[PDB]
Paper text:
Xanthophyllomyces dendrorhous β-fructofuranosidase (Xd-INV, EC 3.2.1.26) is a highly glycosylated dimeric enzyme that belongs to CAZy family GH32 and hydrolyzes sucrose and various fructooligosaccharides (FOS) and fructans releasing fructose. It also catalyzes the synthesis of short-chain FOS, in which the fructosyl moiety is transferred to the sucrose skeleton. All the polyphenolic compounds are bound by stacking their aromatic rings against Trp105, with additional hydrogen bonds from their OH groups to several residues at the active site directly or through several well-ordered water molecules that are linked to the protein.
Also, the crystals were soaked into hydroquinone in absence of fructose to investigate potential additional binding sites for this acceptor. On the other hand, the HQ molecule is stacking against Trp105, with one of its hydroxyls being linked to the C-terminal Leu661 carbonyl through water molecules. As it is observed, HQ and catechol are similarly located in both ternary complexes, while HQ is shifted in the fructose-free HQ-soaked crystals.
Residue numbers in the entry:
A (entry chain A), B (entry chain A): 42 to 665
């Protein structure tokens, strides 16, 4: 096993455990110290203003199993500190008959048991578990734990009658899943249900959704309401909040609703961030975010989606969330977005970026799998003075349109996502910033033009504004992680409305994914404008490439170039001419970003272990 | 619910939880503070000379489940102290995927991991578990834990490859069971295997048996040997030690070998107690003790048996234990005898006495189930100068015979059992002792003659020697727990060789068992004697009646008289005449015995709990 990154890669499958630990590893984002991680969980702003972030964790393994909550905290979403207790960085683990198969996702009641922060989590036990298997009641239940030390440790309620698990009866028969409880307060839902509380006797100030579906009949989000304020044992099932069809699709802009929902949440946003009104704010919009499974041929059969909804009150004192329009939270190799409230009327979302090693060829050599996305402020994105001649504008697929009185302009509303400003400020301030001269891409543009300043390593951000003619057939974008022999190409093609990441040349290592990523981007043309603009921000962090367009479209993916000098970046141009010119301005390179884990050494591997021959006898976990 | 014990019992099923806690409860023996208990486990003499006793425990429940080790210690087998830690009197509990279904029986390696006392125990996980079900590999494994604080707490080895569980592969296919590991040293087996250790490479100084059987083909005791001295991970399967047929019986004196063995152990005894020779002591005998299941119509389908064995070395470097003769450890409502070495060349055995409430009608009102037997010294019982005219003597059923040179007398060898002397000394010393005048039971004997001194409560011992003509048809014995309307009759009938406990009148409460108990007793007639003698000792302790005959035959049973004055005792006589006289001598009453748990108040109930609706979903435990 040679680690010589100045020559072609050898047979890296011969390398020892964690020998490639630092080679591709993100340094500027949330990631476990080592081993397997997946979904964010247990997210809350603590009383001291810091952020507590949990995550699905399997230390010293590179596949899922014994799933536990790993945890850390930060004052700025950007620089993190691990918890360190009797179980290292874990703070909740399988320990009881009701959760021995795994401590799945959960969410926080900020003032719960005895006034302490409280997690409601999916406690799993034995039996077939999955949307494509014949799951039975009891395999997935919902349980409580609380913390008296701000997340350093959690105390589970006792096992038994009137204690854990607190939710165990299936609300409908033949579920595909019953997990990922999302607890939230909602002045809006309280106001809508206030006339019906005699029907259900549920009058608490917390709601919870549970994610799942019904065999042969599509996904379901189930809505519960806390039976009594200040009491956390009894949760009353109201009814299904979101009902979608078996592999139903709202279309090209909206992914596919698959057969089962995972990690669903409910929020209410306005142009500034989180909205806490009862329905009185005419600028606020109700949103559901949710993962779907088995409605996609690739990306692990997983869509991370969102929908704007209009609530209707049913005669049985429940809520129907009718989908108004429906979009995609991230078009790439990410899933399991969680959102949580943050002081200053913010709703912050973060997801998991999986690797692109689906055959598990170099996972042991890495010694880890998975990272988070960046933390994103959610808000209602409003575009004013939109031209009615914007192609496809009135399909209203993943946006709403509202005509002016005179019908000559349109207000566009959609979900906005932007990186939290604390992270952008820390990244810029710690980086070597190069402000680049604006560039017209015309008949003289090479296919690839390196920037006048180059990154020094695999940790940088790029920004640019790409101005196109209304009738362009030109393509432009960014090349990143680039040498002569390895590179990753980020293209926008306004004529097709497609943002692509071409990875045919991303790496000389053949075992990593090399499929083209694709997002749809609608350029809302402005009344009076003779051009249309793409604002593109790209984060490069080890192997992560995380793309943001127009504070709306996000695409996370992975690139694993072998060569030490595959770090370069620049502009891409295709079909640019004297007539079809792409104007590039606001160009900046941030070289270096931030060390997100300053207390951690470069190599936090503790080695890998095998569960031994019993792993196959129990049949629950891969065992490695 | 009336607790008036001066009138007929009402409908006691209306009484609250633990309202009958003190009514029938033993006070002079080992019993859990409250709730469910079954098999003794983890028995060892600690370095300070005290006895550590574990037991299968389910606190705050009256049925089996979440089975754990409860524990206590004693300097004299008689007066006990509970451990008290984070889990109350428990010291091992389900906590890992490999043992979450229960911490079953286990036994002690006195100098184990890092030199500490170490338990090898059956760690159970999910799946069908039972001799009549289709069990699969992994459901029952064998795991290690060690104690750095003399049994106050136990540390399990980690889960995984080269750690727990340490024994998981089934040594043969289609097992009925795979549990109750019994660890022992054996100079005898080491000497027998010393010429074969090149075949198996197993050279350690500890052996272990695992109890089970093969579907359709009878019980098996599997023999393992520690692979290397001082190392406790690797145990090498040698082969089956004991192989019996599907519901095979050696006869009327020997119970039935059923379909599956439980709680089996291996020892070597001589006339004085434990034998540590390599085979050189011609007076020593190899013994196996074992429970069998599904070879009995009653007593919970359970026989506690023992056999004398002759070891043969197989060509594959394993041991066959050939049964020489085969007997019964206790003929009553007891099971799961464990034996362990004690300083002074002793082997001490103790079992579990279950209740006689098999339909669980008053278990909640009790607030507990189960007790131990008394602690018994095992030894080789040798009877010299036995007359060859002793009826049935040469069947050699549960004994061996050796003729004198001249063929006119016989030495009889069998398993001896006697109560440990520490308990007899403490009982006698703390009691009001009444030495009773000898009685000839003749034509003038009433059916029942109360003793000249009477017990004051349900805690007493009786002893007597009953001398019969060689051709008697008379019956005699003891009546205990007796008023005019409730009583329990203990009869011996030499003509049938039957010791019976008649319980038709034991209680006015109809829901308790009232079936007649039966043991076989061989009176070895001595050369020159014109009579034969039964030495009978009876312990009455709450509801326990524990009978010992001739330091050989034991019979544990239960009686639950309601009336406060059902405490009396005396002599029984049937068919005694001027010609057929039963001489009764050495009569003594020990009134009071000892308070075995001086630190405990009379009512140690903590209430009962229900596991709730998930108990039926998991399907592992009753839930109460
Ligand atoms: C199979 O058997 C299993 C084993 O028995 C069983 O699991 C056990 O279940 C029991 C019952 O549910 C659990 O017991 C609960 O424990 C909770 C505390 O749990 C935390 O702490 C314990 C103890 O921690 C000590 O010991 C450890 C180990 O040594 C140390 O590491 C600690 O530092 C600490 O040490 C100090 O204290 C020791 C003595 O205890 C000293 O010896 C020592 O020197 C130290 O000074 C830990 O063991 C726990 O860890 C385990 O669990 C966590 C997850 O929680 C895991 O991550 C971890 O790996 C372990 O598995 C844990 O950290 C108790 O709070 C709880 O007691 C409350 O509830 C019960 C009712 O259920 C009440 O009766 C009781 O009064 C308490 O209620 C009051 O208190 C709370 C808040 O304090 C209130 O909300 C509540 O309303 C109530 O208030 C009362 O008082 C009020 C004011 O005073 C008043 O106003 C009210 O009116 C009211 O009266 C309970 O004891 C036990 O932890 C489980 N153990 C394990 C190992 O899992 C399992 O379930 C069984 N399974 C089945 C299928 O049956
Ligand atoms: C799913 O995830 C689960 C959770 O992660 C996982 O379970 C966990 O498994 C891990 C890995 O097996 C277990 O970790 C082991 O822990 C053993 C100790 O266990 C006892 O103590 C812990 C810790 O106790 C502290 O904290 C608790 C809780 O707060 C307190 O109550 C205690 O008082 C104590 O507190 C002090 O210390 C704290 C910091 O730790 C401080 O914060 C605190 O302030 C205090 O001062 C308890 O939690 C355990 O309780 C749990 O387990 C018991 C049963 O054991 C239950 O009854 C209970 O309910 C709980 O469930 C328990 O009491 C360690 O000994 C062990 O470390 C040894 O082994 C590993 C290898 O496996 C080595 O890497 C390591 O070096 C150690 O080996 C050395 O030491 C031993 C002897 O000391 C030697 O025999 C050995 O050879 C070696 O020697 C070394 O040194 C020699 C000389 O120095 C040298 O010569 C040698 O060469 C060599 O180097 C390991 O850490 C963990 O306990 C499990 N946790 C739980 C909650 O279950 C589960 O398996 C997963 N499941 C699956 C399917 O994957
Ligand atoms: C005395 O100790 C007991 C513990 O033993 C404590 O707890 C009680 O324990 C008993 C079992 O011993 C429980 O009984 C069972 O209850 C089931 C239905 O219960 C629901 O209704 C009652 C009101 O009438 C409520 O009290 C319960 O509330 C509690 O549980 C809920 C969760 O549901 C919590 O949220 C609450 O906070 C409470 O803690 C329940 O809502 C019932 O299904 C079950 O029935 C079986 O057993 C009986 C008797 O043998 C049969 O008649 C019946 O047919 C059922 O038999 C099943 O088993 C057979 C074979 O044996 C199968 O063939 C069938 O499939 C069948 O299903 C049982 O009655 C009791 O609920 C529980 N009470 C609690 C927790 O409060 C007592 O509290 C304690 N007393 C005191 C004062 O401390
Ligand atoms: C680097 O990290 C790893 C942890 O990932 C550490 O541990 C190793 O982990 C791997 C898995 O990653 C283990 O590999 C598996 O080994 C199985 C057979 O192992 C036995 O033989 C070897 C010697 O050749 C021994 O080393 C083992 O000893 C250990 O375990 C025993 C218990 O058995 C303990 O008592 C010891 O003390 C040791 O701790 C074993 O005795 C093997 O069955 C398994 O095979 C599957 O996977 C491979 C590769 O993918 C396939 O080729 C193969 O076909 C098997 O595929 C299964 O799965 C497919 C589908 O995927 C199914 O269709 C089939 O049914 C099939 O069964 C695998 O190779 C390895 O044993 C383990 N080593 C240990 C613990 O020492 C490393 O230690 C660590 N390295 C360092 C230096 O730290
Ligand atoms: C980068 O590395 C490769 C291999 O060492 C080398 O061939 C090439 O000239 C270097 N520079 C580039 C591609 O910019
Ligand atoms: C990282 O640390 C682990 C654990 O000590 C070690 O096995 C591995 O070889 C190291 N990897 C690198 C890149 O240094
Ligand atoms: C309320 O009605 C809805 C719509 O029919 C139904 O799906 C749901 O189960 C009902 N809620 C109940 C029965 O609690
Ligand atoms: C919105 O405006 C467009 C362009 O003026 C027009 O075609 C359409 O009919 C309008 N919709 C409504 C509801 O007025
Ligand atoms: C560098 O990053 C840290 C960690 O996020 C941040 O607090 C600090 O303000 C940054 N430095 C700047 C912007 O100068
Ligand atoms: C004992 O109690 C019963 C019921 O109170 C009474 O009838 C009887 O005379 C008393 N004495 C006896 C049976 O010795
Ligand atoms: C024993 O104590 C328990 C628990 O406090 C109580 O419920 C029960 O009624 C008491 N029983 C008696 C006989 O006093
Ligand atoms: C040794 O031989 C016995 C008798 O045939 C057999 O039952 C046992 O399995 C053998 N031991 C092995 C294969 O380890
Ligand atoms: C043992 O003694 C009895 C009575 O003398 C006799 O019948 C029998 O044959 C003897 N057995 C042997 C082996 O000598
Ligand atoms: C009474 O019992 C205790 C507890 O077993 C024992 O130590 C003591 O010696 C006994 N008293 C006597 C025999 O006088
Ligand atoms: O495969 C299936 C499992 C369960 C069910 O309800 C329908 C189909
Ligand atoms: O769906 C998939 C999940 C994980 C993996 O390794 C490959 C495919
Ligand atoms: O450079 C490249 C070579 C071959 C291919 O198919 C894509 C890119
Ligand atoms: O109108 C415009 C068209 C294209 C371009 O590059 C800039 C402006
Ligand atoms: O948080 C930390 C995790 C691991 C390590 O080695 C140092 C710090
Ligand atoms: O859980 C499992 C682990 C390993 C294997 O081979 C099959 C199932
Ligand atoms: O019932 C049965 C279960 C298992 C087996 O091997 C034979 C019979
Ligand atoms: O076999 C049996 C065991 C327990 C019980 O309650 C009744 C019968
Ligand atoms: O006293 C008794 C009454 C009836 C019976 O069958 C047995 C004893
Ligand atoms: O020989 C004897 C027969 C009977 C009896 O009671 C005493 C002596
Ligand atoms: O050992 C003891 C158990 C229980 C109790 O209450 C007092 C002492
Ligand atoms: O384990 C079980 C508990 C209760 C029940 O009704 C069925 C099974």
């Amino acid at each position: 096993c040679s680690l010589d990154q100045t020559v072609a890669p050898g047979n890296l499958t011969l390398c020892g455990n964690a020998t490639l630990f630092t080679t591709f590893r993100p340094k500027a984002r949330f990631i476990a110290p080592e081993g397997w991680m997946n979904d964010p969980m247990g997210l809350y702003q603590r009383a001291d203003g810091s952020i507590h972030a949990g995550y699905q964790s399997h230390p010293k393994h590179i596949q899922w199993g014994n799933i536990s909550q790993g945890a850390a905290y930060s004052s700025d979403f950007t620089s993190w500190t691990d918890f360190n207790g009797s179980e290292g960085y874990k703070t909740i683990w399988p320990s009881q008959i009701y959760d021995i198969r795994g401590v799945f996702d959960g969410s926080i009641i900020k003032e719960g048991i005895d006034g302490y922060p409280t997690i409601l989590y999916t406690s799993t036990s034995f039996g077939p578990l999955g949307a494509t298997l014949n799951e039975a009641e009891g395999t997935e239940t919902q349980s409580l734990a609380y913390t008296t030390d701000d997340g350093a440790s959690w105390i589970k309620l006792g096992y038994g009658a009137g204690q854990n698990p607190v939710i165990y009866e299936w609300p409908e028969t033949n579920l595909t899943g019953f997990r990922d409880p999302y607890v939230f307060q909602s002045p809006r839902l309280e106001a809508l249900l206030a006339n019906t509380t005699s029907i259900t006797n549920a009058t608490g100030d917390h709601f919870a959704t549970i994610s799942g579906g019904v065999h042969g009949d599509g996904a379901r989000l189930f809505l519960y309401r806390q039976h009594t304020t200040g009491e956390f044992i009894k949760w009353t099932y109201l009814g299904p909040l979101v009902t979608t069809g078996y592999k139903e699709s709202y279309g090209e802009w909206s992914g596919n609703y698959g057969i089962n929902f995972e990690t669903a949440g409910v929020t209410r946003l306005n142009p500034a961030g989180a909205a806490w009104d009862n329905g009185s704010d005419t600028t606020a919009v109700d949103f559901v975010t949710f993962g779907t499974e088995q409605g996609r041929a690739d990306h692990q059969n997983h869509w991370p989606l969102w929908a704007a909804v209009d609530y209707e009150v049913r005669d049985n004192g429940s809520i129907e969330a009718v989908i108004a329009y429906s979009g995609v939270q991230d078009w790439g190799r990410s899933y399991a977005y969680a959102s949580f409230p943050v002081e200053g009327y913010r709703q912050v979302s973060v997801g998991w970026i999986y690797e692109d090693d689906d055959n598990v060829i170099l996972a042991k050599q890495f010694g880890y799998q998975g990272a988070f996305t960046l933390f994103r402020d959610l808000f209602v994105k409003v575009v004013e003075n939109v031209s009615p001649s914007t192609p496809g504008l009135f399909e209203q697929a993943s946006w709403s349109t509202k005509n002016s009185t005179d019908g000559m302009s349109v207000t566009v509303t959609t979900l906005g996502q932007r990186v939290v400003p604390e992270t952008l400020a820390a990244y810029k301030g710690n980086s070597t910033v190069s402000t680049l001269a604006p560039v017209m891409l015309n008949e003289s543009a090479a296919a690839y033009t390196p920037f006048s300043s180059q990154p020094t390593d695999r940790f940088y951000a790029l920004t640019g504004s790409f101005e196109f003619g209304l009738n362009t057939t030109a393509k432009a974008g960014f090349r990143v992680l680039a040498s002569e022999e390895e590179y990753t190409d980020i293209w926008f093609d306004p004529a097709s409305e497609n943002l692509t990441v071409v990875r045919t040349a991303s790496s000389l290592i053949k075992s990593f994914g090399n499929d083209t990523e694709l997002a749809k981007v609608k350029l809302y043309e402005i009344v009076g404008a003779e051009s249309k603009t793409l604002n593109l921000t790209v984060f490069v962090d080890g192997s992560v490439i995380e793309i943001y367009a127009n504070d709306e479209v996000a695409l996370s993916t992975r690139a694993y170039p072998w060569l030490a000098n595959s770090t370069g970046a620049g502009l891409l141009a295709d079909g640019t001419t004297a007539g079809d010119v792409v104007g590039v301005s606001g160009l900046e390179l941030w070289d270096g970003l931030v060390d997100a884990w300053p207390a951690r050494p470069a190599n936090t591997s503790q080695g890998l272990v095998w569960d031994g021959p019993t792993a196959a006898m129990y049949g629950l976990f891969a065992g490695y």
